[PDB]
Amino acid sequence: AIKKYKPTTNGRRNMTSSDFAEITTSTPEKSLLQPLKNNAGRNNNGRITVRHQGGGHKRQYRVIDFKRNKDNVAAVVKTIEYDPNRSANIALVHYEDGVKAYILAPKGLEVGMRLVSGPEADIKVGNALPLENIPVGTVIHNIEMKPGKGGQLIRSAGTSAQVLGKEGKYVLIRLNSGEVRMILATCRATIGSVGNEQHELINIGKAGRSRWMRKRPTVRGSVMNPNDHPHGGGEGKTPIGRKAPVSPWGQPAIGYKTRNKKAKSDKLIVRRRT
Template identity: 60%
Template sequence: DPLKSLTKGKKFKSGRDSSGRISIRRRGGGHKRKYRLIDFNRRDKFSIPARVASIEYDPNRSANIALLVYKDGEKRYIISPKGIKVGDVLESGPNAPIKIGNALPLENIPIGRTVHNIELNVGKGGQLVRSAGGYAMILASDGNYVTVKLSSGEMRLIFKKCIATIGEIGNEDYANISIGKAGKS
């Protein structure tokens, strides 16, 4: 079960618009979900090490999530990178070591490394590359901007102070799951 302090209720829209009328037909039903509050930012926890307490399923996204317990006692969920396991110690900040699951400013990550959960605006939290199996690659650093190649092939210039997490996102077999029939989707 997810940590109660890090979840909240999630109301389904069921294809209704703000006035309650059906704007998209045939939406609705399905299993109830609790929304897990996920830390896409990790800025306010710079230089505080965190232990991976568990890796959990999240019905709201394709990736799994990892529960971190910080040295100061706080618990938070992050998107689970590929290759981390329970008991690993992760860190964030400009001086964090270059290893999977650590979050650093783009300027501090070596060229050629794969990253995920990339910020577009400083302090806003990760917005790019957040789904299962996703990764982007750092290609070059020039002045105030870093060139990142997304899995679509798109090249983006992103400000060097924006934060990204090192490594690929786990649960990469999600794309191979066979739904089987229309009733199961």
């Protein structure tokens, strides 16, 4: 659940966080940890390519098994663990042959559940099947766009998609965004929705907490100089003073669609949203 802090200090005032009740351990799997460095939004050129990133707490990467292609044996859910890299929680699972792995923790997952993967897997929370074997109307997550590539869609905490129907070699899906699109039936997905649904309700509370989470301050263009931002300049506070608000590079910021107009996936996208 969400616990709210008493207003002992102005910073602490109105702050909320997760009780982490579901989390069952604080000892990640040494076998599956990998190092990660904070790129701080800088590319191989070393230039800041994405602003407002850097700093914050050090993290170790956890190797998630988005592929879920080990259909030989069932995996028993050993623990539910906190993952610094993703909004959702992860689940450590033991395969009966001794392979350890991490998966996204679906809503309702419990220690001891024996998950299965493959066409014969039953329609149970956490099981993974090719999209063709999933009955219509099912709620799924961790969808992969290309067979064997591993789940890519519907992985944030609390998100979910729904299977709407079949056609040809594709399966109709409503994504978390509400977009309805076709996806190759041979692709896999996991039954259920991503747990930790409460994540969105957290109130960060103070600037220092954003910094912990690796968000550097965001400066409004309206208070920059003309050579810095299209909105910069002017005496006193100023309105936008242009045809429309624009990014620092002049791209309109309100309502201007940026999807490629000749995208190859327009053939597979049935109904758009967002």
